[PDB]
Each structure stands twice: as C-alpha cells, then as structure tokens.
Design a protein around this ligand. Structure first.
Ligand SMILES: Cn1c(=O)n(Cc2ccc(C(=O)O)cc2)c(=O)c2cc(C#CCc3ccccc3)ccc21
Ligand SMILES: Cn1c(=O)n(Cc2ccc(C(=O)O)cc2)c(=O)c2cc(C#CCc3ccccc3)ccc21
Ligand SMILES: Cn1c(=O)n(Cc2ccc(C(=O)O)cc2)c(=O)c2cc(C#CCc3ccccc3)ccc21
Ligand SMILES: Cn1c(=O)n(Cc2ccc(C(=O)O)cc2)c(=O)c2cc(C#CCc3ccccc3)ccc21
Ligand SMILES: Cn1c(=O)n(Cc2ccc(C(=O)O)cc2)c(=O)c2cc(C#CCc3ccccc3)ccc21
Ligand SMILES: Cn1c(=O)n(Cc2ccc(C(=O)O)cc2)c(=O)c2cc(C#CCc3ccccc3)ccc21
Ligand SMILES: Cn1c(=O)n(Cc2ccc(C(=O)O)cc2)c(=O)c2cc(C#CCc3ccccc3)ccc21
Ligand SMILES: Cn1c(=O)n(Cc2ccc(C(=O)O)cc2)c(=O)c2cc(C#CCc3ccccc3)ccc21
Ligand SMILES: [Ca+2]
Ligand SMILES: [Ca+2]
Ligand SMILES: [Ca+2]
Ligand SMILES: [Ca+2]
Ligand SMILES: [Ca+2]
Ligand SMILES: [Ca+2]
Ligand SMILES: [Ca+2]
Ligand SMILES: [Ca+2]
Ligand SMILES: [Ca+2]
Ligand SMILES: [Ca+2]
Ligand SMILES: [Ca+2]
Ligand SMILES: [Ca+2]
Ligand SMILES: [Ca+2]
Ligand SMILES: [Ca+2]
Ligand SMILES: [Ca+2]
Ligand SMILES: [Ca+2]
Ligand SMILES: [Ca+2]
Ligand SMILES: [Ca+2]
Ligand SMILES: [Ca+2]
Ligand SMILES: [Ca+2]
Ligand SMILES: [Ca+2]
Ligand SMILES: [Ca+2]
Ligand SMILES: [Ca+2]
Ligand SMILES: [Ca+2]
Ligand SMILES: [Zn+2]
Ligand SMILES: [Zn+2]
Ligand SMILES: [Zn+2]
Ligand SMILES: [Zn+2]
Ligand SMILES: [Zn+2]
Ligand SMILES: [Zn+2]
Ligand SMILES: [Zn+2]
Ligand SMILES: [Zn+2]
Ligand SMILES: [Zn+2]
Ligand SMILES: [Zn+2]
Ligand SMILES: [Zn+2]
Ligand SMILES: [Zn+2]
Ligand SMILES: [Zn+2]
Ligand SMILES: [Zn+2]
Ligand SMILES: [Zn+2]
Ligand SMILES: [Zn+2]
Lengths: 167, 164, 167, 166, 166, 163, 167, 167
C-alpha cells in the first residue's frame, strides 16, 4: 500500500533541469551562469543534486515565454507577474517559467534573473512564500545590492525541514 | 517559512460524485453500474460513503475526454495512459478522467471500466501506487480470471479506518 | 548501483491466456484442446490455475506467425526453430509464439502442437532446458513412444520447486 | 531447471563485434575506444572479451540512425545517444550508437569510450546507478581525461554479479 | 477505615494526550503517526476518543527519556525495559514514558514505536499484562508477522471489559 | 507446586525468521534459497506460515558461528556436531545455529545446507529425533541423492495438524 | 597522589555531547545546528574540542524535559526557569537540561535555543554568572537581534581563565 | 627463560586472519575488500604481514554477531557499540567482532566496514584509544568524506612505537 506523499517534496535527491530556451536580454553564458548559481543556492544547504539536461524531459523544465505559453497562468507583459514555478510533482510540477516581457539582467537593472530563478526554484522544491521580509521566499522582489549571496536563515530552515542539511 | 500542507484524506465521510459525460462504448446504465461498483469496493472496507449528484459541483467529478481535455495532462490516443485522478482536496481534487480513446467495456475486451475506475478512485481517496503485483493499486492494468486485494484494504483502512 | 531483479515465477496463481489467432493445419477445437492439455500438464502438479480469455490482454498471449512477426526474434520457415516463449513478468512476459511455417498436428505428423506448447509453456512459467534426454524440457523434439502423456519427473520437480506441489 | 535470477552471462568468455564504424573517427580510434571500454569491466572481474571480425558475437556493436532494426529508433542529433540490451540471446548484450551524434576521442561532442563503457555496463547486467559520480549514472558527464578509474559504485555493481578479478 | 479508591480504569471516556518531547530516531511526523495509530487501535473498539494537545497538562503525557527521568522508575540503557506507563488516574497516572536508549522505528528494526506505544497505552487505559502469548498486552515484545495490524481478540475483550464496545 | 511451561508448539501458526549472518561457503542467494526451501518442507504439510524479517527480533533467529558463540553449547570444529536448534519458546527458543567449521553446500559435498536446516527447523517446531532411519529427523546425517518422509509428516502433524 | 582540582573545570580538552531527545518546537536539524553553534562559541576561544555522540554516555548529556525530570531542580511550566546545567564533574556534571514548556525557536520569538544553550554550556564548562550585563553569562536572558555572534569580552576572559586560548 | 612482554604486542610479523562469517549487508567481495584494505592501513607503515586463512585457527578471528556472541562483551542492538577487538595474545587475543545489528556499508551510509575494521585492527595489534580527535584510534566514529585513505600521523607513531617502520 501507499498513501500520497505528506508534503509536496521530491522523493529523490538527484534532480535534473533543462534550459528549453533563452532570453534575448542576456548572453547564453550569462543565463546558464544565473541558473547554475540559483540551483547552487539550494544544493549548498541540502543533499539535493542538480544535473543539467540539454534535450529531453527533465524534472525541472525551464523556459522563457510571454502571454499564453501553455498553462493556466498566462503572463501579462512588462512588470506585474515576473515568473512562476510549479511545486514538486509529475509533468508540469517543478517547472519554472519566466516572463520574457521583463528585462532580465545579471545586474541591478530590470530584474535580476539569478534572483528570481533562485526564488522560483524554492517553489519548484516545495517552498511556499515566507512571511519574513528578509527571506528569499518573501513574495516581493527585492534587490539588496550585489554582494556575496548567503541564503537567509528562514530559507535555509525551510528547505532543510524538507530535505535535511547537506553533507 | 511555509510549505504546502497536504490533503491526504478527505476531511469528511459523506463524499459526492458526478458523472459529467459518458463514453460511446457502453450504455449509461453500464457506466453507472461500473462507477457504483468502483465506489462500493472502497466504501465496503471503510467508513466512507458516496452520493451521486446529477447537477452541480461534487467532490469527485468524473469525465471522459481525449487528448488535451482542460488540465494540461493530455491523453495519448489508444493504449498508453488509460485514465488519471487527482489526490484529495478542493476544486480539481478527487476528479477522475478517463481516456475516451480506449474501448471501455464490462468485460475483458479493451479495458474494463469498473477495474480502471476502482483503481483511479484509489488515488482520489489518498492512495498512491503499490509495489505488490496483485494489488488493485498496482500501476499496471491486468484483467484476471471481485474481492479487493488485502494490500489495498491495508492502504485505505490506514487513512480512513475499518468502518465499521 | 542496481541490477535487474527478475521474476522466475508468476507471483500469482490464477493465470490467464488468450489464443490470439489460429493455425491453418488444425480446427479451432483441436487447437484449443491442444493448449488446454498443455496447461493441464503443468497445473496438475502445481497450485497453478489457468483461465482462457477470448479478448483483451492475458498473462500468456498465444499466437501463430511466420518470419518477422513483431518481436525481432524472427522465425525461419519450415523446420529449425519451432516456437518460442518469453520468461515470466510483464507485457511480452509469458507469451508463446508458434512458427506457422511448421505443420501443426495432433498426431506424429509434422510437429505435435500439444507437445511443443507443453514444452513452451514451461518457459512461460519459469523453466529453462534440461540435459535429460527423456525430459519435456530438452532442446530437441522427439515423438515417443508412450501413447498417454505422463509428465517426466525432471519437469515435475523442476516446476514444483518454483510453485509448490498440486494440492 | 529454472531461469537465472539476474540478467547476467552464465559464462566469463564473451565475444564482441564492431559491425560498422562511425565517420567521425578513424577505425583505429574506434577500436581503441571499444577496447578500452571493455577493459574497464574486465580489469575488475574474471570476464574476458575476444574481438570477432565477422560472424555472430555475444555483444554486437553497431552505429545507426533513426530506425536501425529494433523497437528503439534513434532521434537525430542529441537526445538518445546510444543503447544496449541486458544479457541474453540474440539482441541481448548488443550495443547501438546513434551516428547522428558527433563521436570523439576528446571532450568535444560525445566521447565514444565513455558512452561505450556505460553501455557495456548494461550489456553485462548493470542498470542505472543513483550515485551521480558513477559511470552508470544515466546522464553523460565528461570530467576531463585524466587516467580512468572505475568509480567504486560501478566496481561494486559489476562484482556483485561476476565477482572480482584474479 | 478507608482504602485507596479506584479502579485503575478511566472514569471518563474522553482523554487528551501530549507529546512532550521527541526521540532522535524518527522524524516528528513519524512519531506523531505512530502514536496516532496506537491510540486508534483502542478507540476503534471502544467509546474512548483521544484528542492531542500541543501545550499544557493532558491526561496522557508522553515523553522520551533515559535513566532517572523524574518518576523514580529509572530506565536501564539498551534492551531490558523498553518503556512504561502508569495505570489510569490523576497526575503521573496514564502517562507513558519511552526509553530513548532503545532505537525506535516504524519497521522491524530496534523496537517498533507504534507497537510498544499501543501496548503501553493499554496500561494507560487500565489493562495489566495478559497470559495470552498472542495478545498485544503480553509482557514480552514480539514483532510479527502479519502486516496490517488487527487488534487481537484478547485485547479487544480486555479493553471492552472496562469500557465496553465501540 | 509449579512445573515449567510446555515446549510443545508455537501457539501461533504464523512464525517469523531472520538470517542474522552468512557462511563463507555459499552465496547470499544460495543460503536464502536453502532456508526458504527448508521452511517450505514443513509449511506445506501444516498450517504453519513463515515470514522473513531483515531486522530485529524474529521468532526463529538463524546464524552461523563457530566454537563458543554465545549460548554455552559450543561447536567442535570440523565434522561431528553440525548444527543445533532450540525447542519452541521465547528468546533462544526456535533459534537455529550452524557450525561454520563445516563446509556448507547445495549438493552432496560437505554438508547440504538445506537438508541440515530442514532437520534443525524440525527441532525449532517441536520435534525430537526419530528412530526411523529413513526420516529427516533421524539423528545421523545421510545425503540420499525432496519429498518429506511419512514419519516426519506424521510427526509435525501430530503437533500442528495437517493444515 | 592527587588533590581535588581547585576549580570545577574539565581535566581534558576533548569533551563529548549527546542530544538525548528533541523539542517539538524545531526540526531535528535546527536543534542540532543550535547546539553545534553554542559549542562553537566556546571552542573558538579555547583548546576545547566537542565531539557528538548519538548513543551511550557523553560528558555533556543534553535533554528536553518538563517539571520533574530526574534531579533536584524541577522546571516550572512556561517562562521562569528556562534551562539549567551542572558544572564539570562525573555523572550529572556538565549536563544541560532545557525546559520544554518553553517555546524554543531559531529566531527572535519565544526563546532562542542557541542563545540559551551557549549560556548553559558556559555553566557546563565551569563558568558561573557574570556581573557584566553585556556578558552571555549574565543571568538574565536578552536577545539583541540576529547578527554574526561574537562572544563578549567578559565571557572570553572567563573561559580563558580556565582553559586558556586555543589555536 | 622468558618474561611476559612489556606491552600487549605480537611477537611475530607474520599474522593470519580468517573471516569466520559474513554480514547480510554487503556482498562477500565488498567485505573481503574492506578487511583487506583495513589490514593494509597497518602493514603499509610496519613490517607486519597479513595472510588470510579460509578454514582453521588464525591469529585474528573475525566474525559478525549479535547480542551474546561468546565473550563478556555482548552487543546491544542497533547503534551504541559497533565492534570490539581484543589486544594481542593467545586464543581470543586479536579477534575482531562486529555487531551485525548495525548496517554495514561500503559508503557513508550506516557504518563503513573498512573504517571500523581498521580502527578495530589497531586494537588487535596493540593500540588503545588516542586522545587525538583526528586519529583513527580516537574512540568515536567519524566519516570524513570519501577520499584516498592516508593513516593519520598519531596512528603511524603508535603502531611504529610497537613494531617499527616497514622496510
Ligand atoms: C542574500 N541576498 C543577497 O545577498 N542579495 C544581493 C545579491 C547578491 C548576489 C547577486 C548576484 O549574484 O547576481 C544579486 C543580489 C539579494 O539581492 C537578496 C535578495 C533576496 C530576496 C528576495 C525576495 C524575492 C526575490 C526574487 C523574487 C521574488 C522575491 C534574498 C536574499 C538576498
Ligand atoms: C481481484 N481482482 C479480480 O478479481 N479481477 C477479475 C475481475 C473481476 C470482476 C470484474 C467485474 O466485475 O467486471 C472484472 C475483473 C481483476 O481483474 C483484478 C484486477 C486487479 C488489478 C489491478 C491493477 C490495475 C487495474 C486497473 C488499472 C490500473 C492497475 C486487482 C484485482 C482484481
Ligand atoms: C511423456 N511424453 C509422451 O508421452 N510422449 C508421447 C505422446 C503422448 C501423448 C501425445 C498427445 O496427447 O498428443 C503425444 C505424444 C511424447 O512424445 C513426449 C515427448 C517429449 C518430448 C520432448 C522434447 C521436446 C523438445 C521441444 C519441444 C517439445 C518437446 C516429452 C515427453 C513425452
Ligand atoms: C573515472 N572517470 C573519468 O576519469 N572520467 C574522465 C575521463 C577519463 C578518460 C577518458 C578517455 O580515455 O577518453 C575520458 C574521460 C570520466 O569522464 C568519467 C565519467 C563517468 C561517467 C559517467 C556517466 C555517463 C557516462 C556516459 C554515458 C552516460 C552516463 C564516470 C567515471 C569517469
Ligand atoms: C496484530 N499484530 C501485528 O500485526 N503485528 C505486526 C505489525 C503490524 C503492523 C505494524 C505497523 O503498522 O507499524 C507493526 C507490526 C505485531 O507485531 C503484533 C504484535 C503484538 C504484540 C505484542 C507483545 C508486545 C509486548 C511489549 C511491547 C509491544 C508488544 C500483538 C499483535 C500484533
Ligand atoms: C527425502 N530425502 C531426500 O530426498 N534426500 C535427497 C535430497 C534431495 C534434494 C536435495 C536438495 O534439494 O538439495 C538434497 C537431498 C535426502 O538426502 C534426504 C535426507 C534425509 C535425512 C536425514 C537425516 C539428517 C539430515 C540432516 C541432519 C541430521 C540428520 C531425509 C530425507 C531425504
Ligand atoms: C553577541 N551576542 C549577540 O550577537 N546576540 C545577537 C544574536 C546573534 C545571533 C543569534 C542566532 O544565531 O540565532 C541570535 C542572537 C545576542 O543576542 C547576544 C545575547 C547575549 C546574551 C545574554 C544573556 C543570557 C542569554 C541567554 C540565557 C541567559 C542569559 C550575549 C551576546 C549576544
Ligand atoms: C584518513 N581518514 C580518512 O581519509 N577518512 C575518509 C575515508 C576514506 C576512505 C574510505 C573508504 O574507502 O571507504 C572511507 C573514509 C576517514 O573517514 C577517516 C576516519 C578516521 C577516523 C576515526 C575515528 C573512528 C573510526 C572508526 C571507528 C571508531 C573511531 C581517521 C582517518 C580517516
Ligand atoms: Ca517537471
Ligand atoms: Ca510581466
Ligand atoms: Ca525580455
Ligand atoms: Ca473535486
Ligand atoms: Ca490512452
Ligand atoms: Ca471510448
Ligand atoms: Ca504477457
Ligand atoms: Ca521454423
Ligand atoms: Ca502451418
Ligand atoms: Ca547479442
Ligand atoms: Ca540522438
Ligand atoms: Ca556521427
Ligand atoms: Ca496524566
Ligand atoms: Ca532499556
Ligand atoms: Ca533512541
Ligand atoms: Ca527465538
Ligand atoms: Ca562440527
Ligand atoms: Ca564453513
Ligand atoms: Ca519554565
Ligand atoms: Ca555528565
Ligand atoms: Ca517546547
Ligand atoms: Ca550496537
Ligand atoms: Ca586470536
Ligand atoms: Ca547488519
Ligand atoms: Zn507558466
Ligand atoms: Zn514566489
Ligand atoms: Zn485529465
Ligand atoms: Zn494509478
Ligand atoms: Zn515471437
Ligand atoms: Zn525451450
Ligand atoms: Zn537499437
Ligand atoms: Zn544507460
Ligand atoms: Zn517514567
Ligand atoms: Zn507492559
Ligand atoms: Zn548455538
Ligand atoms: Zn537433530
Ligand atoms: Zn534538570
Ligand atoms: Zn545561568
Ligand atoms: Zn565479542
Ligand atoms: Zn576502539
């Protein structure tokens, strides 16, 4: 027998991801680097392992799009909704979608891709929004100035309550 | 921080269902008898109860569709995915959809609607797949030569209790 | 790491079979009778039970075909290979295929369908060949001799090891 | 006399045959790649691999694109790179490589030696590993050559089946 | 004259419980599930019902501890005493303590927490030890079986002789 | 006065067993198969039923040891004493120990594991040695090139019935 | 021969600790992280080395309890007495008990476990209460906003007066 | 004439071992490999020489056992005591016993057999516990990530102070 899992989490540590397409706003390299760092934010404090896929179906499918892009959450043009991700689960579960009507950056201009990605992947991995205004999983985008990124305590605690700490 | 809390069991015991539409492959009466028996399997071995609504919103919405049918988990034509249901909860929770690109029957021909329904309803109530090859809740369809397998009676008595 | 775990035993006792199509050389009735007896031989010494389905998928799917007939284990025309069956488990598991470039009979002519099916069905259940020249499971086809079929002791003990004895 | 309990070879002496060759490498590069990939497994087991030039070998190696004679057609550049069948008769043990890939002796495209050593793990009865550092992990990763030492998880796996070498 | 009253059986069918602290051996949810299940064993066959408090004094206070842990009934390290519970009644009465020098599990390893907790709650509810070797209330821990816990007949009868049937 | 309790039979027909450790002489699979076979011998002619536990205390704990190995019934090195088991009952009751100074095999060589474990499990279930030279429960090991002899079928059915 | 040491202090630098049980109020990881940090405070300014045991008897046995928990210092329900620890020595010496009628947190709410454990581990190591209101060893709890934690000078001086500086 | 030696040490460089029995937890090969590696740790820095016996009485008799297993040191189920070894001498001297209520592994899961074995064979050769927390002979198990095994200097000195350096 088997009752459904008790919280939306991944029942495995090895996850894969795939950059289906790219934004016109940043170089391919910049985008790969942002996504890589965004995943490292979570793998650094957990036993989670992220392997990149070039083709095929990955657990976490990453795509850029505008307006209607193949689900019940169409984007809205510049500003407003920036991106979204589905919680752990089959098919669409874990997938992260980015509104390519935003201006995506590696800087303080427009919206920082690394930042929104890191936040969205919190969702992909089982985290909902935080009520702590300093948390990465706080609902509203904040850029606090480019520095060494250290995952806030609240987010470390949240992801650790699901997957444990890293070795 | 917050997680997503989960519904793993219907918080209540007077569950409702609605057959939204019907397959070409069987009469209305044949389909209704199949769904009724699929619910009887589970409600015999639990305190759960199932009431059918003809109109309106019910806990368990049953429907027949092909391909993309409004949930972004599309079906795939004949063979392959046979059906799917959603775990317990609000809205889409509990709903069961059958691929109407299969031939549904009351026998060994095509796929047996009672059998697949009985299985999908397992999901609707809190159950996931079983590792035991003889379980109704096994991932793979097999029509054997109906008493609910002991593995499934465990599965479901472990969420709702024996009843009575 | 992982291997492939195997099934060398139908985990259940109420097995189904289906005769998908028929040979030109015998009547439907003679064919069904040949298959019945081939199953009776195994189910007389074990707790195994066999049920015939007329449509749908059965554990043991029985079919007649020639040359490349849909598995990539093609047949070879008259003589040589006579039939084949797959070991227990899923899908193609348990299925038995007979070369219809053979002449199937219920006598000593051509190849006796009961005999070859009986031998094939051992595979479907969990037996490989023996080196006992008298056994039913023995690579080469020989038509004896005896004119009432009694299952040879090798095969009797062979299958009783996997499934247990009659009653 | 029941069926074996794992898909494994019931004999240590195995033969293989390179049926055809890729355009991307010289015959010698390919021979050396396959030779090395077998040597990965024979160095830690009592298994012995003997090349056949023609005829039927236990492990039949071929390059193809799209439909090539089984139920697993290749898909063009990228995606599926190759596959092998577990031990057994006929197609059992056979390894197929998608020649819509760019096969290399290097870090460019896909390394033939590396993919082959992975597929030959399957030909010998190993399924996928869940250790990200193992040869049998499902996803291709080239880590920079370097002397190849078979990761501990793949050593354990293959020896669980065939025992250690002399 | 006067005796000590009671009747070490609850005079009230509605009981509360509190998990005071947690063992290192299992996750919070596993512990909560194991105790939930152990209560349900008893509340399925009686008019008893159990409600969980997160704070305060409850009827059945549940804790893990080792050695001297506050009742002058010290635990003894690995093996031996696994846990104890006090007969029904105020204060220490009805409380269940679990020896955290045992390994607690939701399987056959160490000691199954649910299984011991079910036995212990039997004491909490008024049952002493049974001479029926097959009963939950038999003094000696034995892990069958037998998957899918159906309360043995002796314990069904035993508890119902105090509280009656459901 | 009081005596002690009866070591007659497992008051429950459903029993558990654990293979605590393994002999060098055979593989894990070969050993599991031998014990599975040895339990099947008895469970086919009774309503007894056997479940394998991979951890914890099981009714029948099975181990390989040599010389003195924790019960004060030490083994003797090669040959002679081959193994022993304890009459039904709690703790050590039902347990079977095998002398790992013997060579264990799935053949005529050394000592056939299945055959010795079938005999020992007969003790785990309440049978003593038989005076019937052809029985499994005869004291003296003999490998005769498997249907459970009549004397042992009667023996175990006179405790647990035919099932 | 030997005299009893002049201060209740450990005669070795390698000390072990065991977390006997856990609070309901925080995840296992949060509790481990808090004790580990609390010990790090003292090990960072001394040659003290703290080793975690999972079972058996450690020098510093840590448990959560309520009211009577097996010594002459029963707790008192919520608030009031939060925790206590024994000075160095055999048996109960070095042990730290925490009152589980408190609400233990990894934040500014309730009582911060790391903060209280660090103070109590000071007692475990031979420090008594300080008269310096800015000292961790000041008797009265005070939380001063999640910063990088720097052990105050008084506490540094107190523990060094016993064990000296490390490396 | 002769006096008993001044430490528990082997008065010969040729030592034999026998693996009496095996854990369910690992393959026969994984266990033999783990004990071989364990002995190499010590032979690599000494003149000591290790020969495996398959049958008979060896100097170092190795077994897996649970609870009472034939000496005055019964094991205690999962965790706690992992294994013990006797110091050099006749009979039980040098023998290593492993608690088979542990989960023995060839990785970082449960307890690593090679690691516990190497520690325990230190005892078998005449080392007691170190006070160095980074030493193999430190009393408490610690797995420091999988890397090439290089015996700490404290242990090299201990074993060399008994047997000298390998020539
Ligand atoms: C720790 N931390 C930082 O160091 N920095 C600076 C920073 C460092 C490095 C880079 C870079 O490598 O490009 C960029 C920015 C943040 O900006 C920040 C931001 C949030 C948030 C939120 C809320 C939210 C974000 C996104 C979407 C929705 C909500 C949480 C923590 C931090
Ligand atoms: C106990 N049992 C049976 O008696 N029969 C025969 C049977 C009896 C009565 C009717 C009828 O009233 O029309 C039909 C068929 C099954 O076929 C069967 C099948 C499975 C399964 C599974 C796995 C799975 C099923 C469906 C979907 C996915 C997976 C479990 C138990 C049984
Ligand atoms: C016991 N037995 C017989 O009594 N007879 C006579 C016989 C009796 C009854 C009928 C009938 O009812 O139609 C036919 C033939 C055999 O011929 C025979 C033959 C083999 C074989 C083999 C080897 C092999 C290899 C490959 C395929 C099939 C068989 C094994 C046993 C026996
Ligand atoms: C030990 N090891 C290495 O040293 N190197 C470097 C390396 C050495 C020598 C050559 C050469 O002679 O040409 C090339 C590369 C690897 O790249 C590697 C890679 C994997 C894998 C996997 C997973 C997977 C591979 C292929 C297909 C699918 C999955 C496991 C172990 C190692
Ligand atoms: C009916 N029953 C079982 O099905 N099983 C198996 C079992 C099923 C399900 C779970 C689970 O879901 O976690 C666990 C175990 C028992 O083990 C058992 C055990 C005792 C006893 C006693 C004596 C004693 C003494 C002291 C403490 C505990 C028990 C009575 C009845 C049963
Ligand atoms: C019926 N039976 C046999 O068929 N065979 C042959 C045999 C068949 C199959 C296998 C196998 O599957 O590996 C092995 C051996 C015996 O050897 C035998 C032996 C005893 C005895 C005793 C006395 C004693 C044995 C052990 C320990 C103490 C005393 C009783 C009955 C039988
Ligand atoms: C240096 N220091 C701080 O930086 N902070 C802030 C702080 C930093 C990090 C965390 C954290 O990681 O969660 C929390 C709080 C303190 O609050 C503090 C508090 C006391 C005290 C006392 C007195 C007493 C405490 C406890 C019990 C009894 C008495 C001494 C020093 C400090
Ligand atoms: C040098 N060294 C390491 O490199 N590694 C890593 C390591 C390398 C290779 C393998 C492997 O092949 O499986 C495993 C682990 C250790 O873990 C370690 C551990 C201790 C200790 C202690 C204390 C104690 C151990 C065992 C029992 C009791 C006490 C001392 C030194 C080292
Ligand atoms: Ca996905
Ligand atoms: Ca937008
Ligand atoms: Ca854009
Ligand atoms: Ca619904
Ligand atoms: Ca379909
Ligand atoms: Ca249809
Ligand atoms: Ca089939
Ligand atoms: Ca032919
Ligand atoms: Ca024909
Ligand atoms: Ca082949
Ligand atoms: Ca491809
Ligand atoms: Ca190519
Ligand atoms: Ca109470
Ligand atoms: Ca105890
Ligand atoms: Ca514990
Ligand atoms: Ca026992
Ligand atoms: Ca002997
Ligand atoms: Ca032996
Ligand atoms: Ca208090
Ligand atoms: Ca202490
Ligand atoms: Ca608390
Ligand atoms: Ca232990
Ligand atoms: Ca010795
Ligand atoms: Ca073990
Ligand atoms: Zn979207
Ligand atoms: Zn968000
Ligand atoms: Zn649908
Ligand atoms: Zn399903
Ligand atoms: Zn075929
Ligand atoms: Zn055949
Ligand atoms: Zn192919
Ligand atoms: Zn692969
Ligand atoms: Zn107590
Ligand atoms: Zn009790
Ligand atoms: Zn013994
Ligand atoms: Zn005997
Ligand atoms: Zn205290
Ligand atoms: Zn204080
Ligand atoms: Zn010992
Ligand atoms: Zn030690």
């Amino acid at each position: 027998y088997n009752v459904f899992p008790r919280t939306l989490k991944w029942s495995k540590m090895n996850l894969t991801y795939r950059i289906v397409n790219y934004t016109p706003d940043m170089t391919h390299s910049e985008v790969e680097k942002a996504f890589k760092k965004a995943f490292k934010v979570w793998s650094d404090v957990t036993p989670l392992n992220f392997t990149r896929l070039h083709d095929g179906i990955a657990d976490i499918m990453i795509s850029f799009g505008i307006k209607e892009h193949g689900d019940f959450y169409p984007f809205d043009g510049p500003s407003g909704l920036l991106a979204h991700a589905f919680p752990p689960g089959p098919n669409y579960g874990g997938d992260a979608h980015f509104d390519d009507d935003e201006t995506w950056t590696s800087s303080s201009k427009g919206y920082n891709l690394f930042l929104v990605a890191a936040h969205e992947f919190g969702h992909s991995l089982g985290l909902d929004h935080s009520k702590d205004p300093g948390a990465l999983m706080f609902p509203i985008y904040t850029y606090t100035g480019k520095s060494h990124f250290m995952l806030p305590d609240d987010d470390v605690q949240g992801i650790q309550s699901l997957y444990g700490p890293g070795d």
